[PDB]
C-alpha cells in the first residue's frame, strides 16, 4: 500500500521546508528517512525460547513485518551466555511499511506513554540517525491488555540521508517528532 500521511508529509510539506531551511541545490541531497531498524536486547529470554516467539509475533503486528533473531559471537560468561546460541531480535523495515509503522509511532505510540515528556534531543548520533528506548511495547495499537505476559522492552533506530544532527533534527521535527526542547 504505497500511500499515507507520512508518505506525503515528507513531500508536500517537508520537502520544501528543508530547501528553505538549509538550501540545497539538488533533489537528492535533501535528508530522507529510508531505513527503520527495530531491536531487542532479549538476554532475558535466554531460557524460554517460548517468550522468544511472543516478542517476535508481537513485533509482527506492531512492525507490520516478519521478525528475525541473532545469537551472540563471544557471549558473556558471567550473565549466562557463552557462544553462538543466545538471542537478540532485530527487524529492519524499509519502503512503505516503514512509514505505516512510523504513523503509529508519533500519533499513537508516543501520545499514550506513561508520562511521556519528549524525545530526548541528545539522542542524535552526531551524524544523521536516531535511536531511542521504550519499555512497554503495549502502547502499540494492535497490542491488547490481556495478552502481554511480561513487559518486554526494546529500542528503535532510523537511518537518514542526514549528514549532521542539525540536518536530522530539522528533518524529524518536520515529519513530526515530539522533541523535548
Amino acid at each position: 500500500p504505497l500511500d499515507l500521511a507520512l508518505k506525503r508529509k515528507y513531500y508536500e510539506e517537508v520537502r520544501p521546508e528543508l530547501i528553505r531551511r538549509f538550501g540545497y541545490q539538488n533533489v537528492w541531497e535533501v535528508p530522507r528517512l529510508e531505513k527503520v531498524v527495530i531491536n531487542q536486547g532479549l538476554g532475558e529470554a535466554k531460557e524460554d525460547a517460548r517468550i522468544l516467539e511472543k516478542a517476535a509475533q508481537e513485533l509482527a503486528l506492531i512492525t507490520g513485518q516478519k521478525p528475525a533473531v541473532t545469537r551472540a559471537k563471544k557471549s558473556i560468561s558471567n550473565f549466562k551466555l557463552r557462544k553462538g546460541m543466545p538471542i537478540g531480535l532485530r527487524v529492519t523495515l524499509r519502503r512503505d511499511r516503514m512509514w505505516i509503522f512510523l504513523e503509529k509511532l508519533l500519533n499513537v505510540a508516543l501520545p499514550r506513554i506513561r508520562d511521556f515528556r519528549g524525545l530526548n534531543p541528545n539522542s542524535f548520533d552526531g551524524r544523521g540517525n536516531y535511536n531511542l528506548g521504550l519499555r512497554e511495547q503495549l502502547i502499540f495499537p494492535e497490542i491488547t491488555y490481556d495478552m502481554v505476559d511480561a513487559l518486554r522492552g526494546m529500542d528503535i533506530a532510523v537511518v537518514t540521508t542526514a549528514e549532521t544532527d542539525e540536518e536530522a533534527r530539522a528533518l524529524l521535527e518536520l515529519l513530526g517528532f515530539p522533541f523535548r526542547k
Partner: peptide, 30 residues
Amino acid sequence: VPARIICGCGNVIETYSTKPEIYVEVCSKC
C-alpha cells in the same frame, strides 16, 4: 487494509495497517 483509528477523544484516522477496527484513546488529537 484500511485501519481506522477511532481514538477516544475525538478523531478517526484512516491509516494503513492490520484490522480496520483500531480502538484507541488520547492520541495526537488530545
